[PDB]
Amino acid sequence: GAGPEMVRGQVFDVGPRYTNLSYIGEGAYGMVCSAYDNVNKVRVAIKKISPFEHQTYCQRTLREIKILLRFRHENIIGINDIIRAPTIEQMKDVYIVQDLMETDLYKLLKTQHLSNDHICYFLYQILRGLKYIHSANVLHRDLKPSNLLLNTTCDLKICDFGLARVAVATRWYRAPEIMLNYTKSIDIWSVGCILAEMLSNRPIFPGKHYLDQLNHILGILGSPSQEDLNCIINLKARNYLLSLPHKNKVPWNRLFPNADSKALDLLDKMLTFNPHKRIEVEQALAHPYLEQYYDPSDEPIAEAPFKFDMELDDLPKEKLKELIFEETARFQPG
Numbered sequence: 001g002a003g004p005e006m007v008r009g010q011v012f013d014v015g016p017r018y019t020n021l022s023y024i025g026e027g028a029y030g031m032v033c034s035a036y037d038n039v040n041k042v043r044v045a046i047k048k049i050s051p052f053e054h055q056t057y058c059q060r061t062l063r064e065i066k067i068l069l070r071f072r073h074e075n076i077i078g079i080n081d082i083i084r085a086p087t088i089e090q091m092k093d094v095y096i097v098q099d100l101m102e103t104d105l106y107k108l109l110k111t112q113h114l115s116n117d118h119i120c121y122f123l124y125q126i127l128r129g130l131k132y133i134h135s136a137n138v139l140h141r142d143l144k145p146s147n148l149l150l151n152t153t154c155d156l157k158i159c160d161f162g163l164a165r166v167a168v169a170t171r172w173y174r175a176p177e178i179m180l181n182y183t184k185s186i187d188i189w190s191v192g193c194i195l196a197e198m199l200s201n202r203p204i205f206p207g208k209h210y211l212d213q214l215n216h217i218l219g220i221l222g223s224p225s226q227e228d229l230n231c232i233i234n235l236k237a238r239n240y241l242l243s244l245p246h247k248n249k250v251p252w253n254r255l256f257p258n259a260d261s262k263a264l265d266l267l268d269k270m271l272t273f274n275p276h277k278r279i280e281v282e283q284a285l286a287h288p289y290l291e292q293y294y295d296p297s298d299e300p301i302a303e304a305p306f307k308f309d310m311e312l313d314d315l316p317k318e319k320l321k322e323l324i325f326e327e328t329a330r331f332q333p334g
């Protein structure tokens with residue numbers, strides 16, 4: 001035997017099936033590598049997750065595993081295999097094996113300029129995948145360029161469903177009502193921020209903190225109306241927004257001077273302050289900007305709305321560890 005595999009001084013115990021590890025990146029309680037699968041004879045992606053110190057991390061890990069194993073769609077990453085220890089006492093990590101994509105939209109927008117036809121095609125695929133997520137009555141809640149995977153041929157897949165919930169995130173893509181007070185409309189806001197980013201290669205609302213975010217949004221949309229603030233919002237935010245002087249609305253064609261007129265019309269409908277007046281996923285897909293790709297006969301929806309049989313928020317982390325251990329059992333030999 002070669003012993004357990006390692007990446008940057010950390011254990012990455014995926015051998016003997018998965019070898020030739022190459023580091024991709026890491027988060028607060030996870031590390032992602034590429035690996036060679038000696039069974040399917042292809043490179044795969046492997047996310048190491050260590051969530052057992054916290055109840056919220058345990059919830060997140062179980063939600064993503066349950067959602068991605070149920071979900072079946074071309075524009076949503078799947079789970080091909082799961083590695084963990086043979087006993088619950090030894091399980092300190094969970095390894096989720098997924099299809100390897102060439103890059104994410106964060107890295108592509110950092111090095112490449114997108115033509116209008118590539119923006120239109122990437123937007124179409126995001127909303128196609130989102131149409132399936134929302135048809136299952138699930139919210140992604142963390143749509144951003146780093147959670148959108150791309151391959152050589154331009155095929156797109158949505159990943160990272162840890163924050164997903166049935167119907168918190170990166171602040172630049174957060175809907176104003178998350179900061180103010182959530183609903184399916186928060187994902188449409190995020191897609192709106194991604195479209196704006198694809199047009200100019202720069203984040204549309206790059207706030208350094210929660211107040212700077214709201215100031216950035218108001219800087220473009222202008223001061224909110226009485227109806228825009230008439231919702232169940234926190235007193236601090238309301239009083240802060242009412243204390244601000246008037247801000248004029250910046251026309252979309254002034255922010256993106258050479259962007260396609262149809263793309264700015266859709267951008268306007270997605271980046272609407274009031275979530276009730278914001279365009280829904282089906283109407284977005286049927287918008288004139290996405291006409292050359294819209295195909296209702298080839299846009300699948302979930303057979304039924306997704307639901308958790310248990311109250312995951314209420315369960316102690318020891319109970320969630322047992323549910324994670326049992327959920328990953330079908331990937332063990334037997």
Ligand SMILES: O=c1[nH][nH]c2cc(Nc3ncc(Nc4ccccc4)c(Nc4cc(C5CC5)n[nH]4)n3)ccc12
Pocket residue numbers: 024025032034045046047077098099100101102103104107146147148149159160
């Ligand atoms: O879990 C994730 N949430 N958001 C993420 C962004 C990543 N970014 C990423 N960049 C590049 C590649 N491709 C690559 C290929 C060869 C050499 C170096 C990198 C990549 N691929 C990838 C990730 C996944 C699954 C999400 C883990 N499949 N394919 N991901 C990787 C993982 C995640």
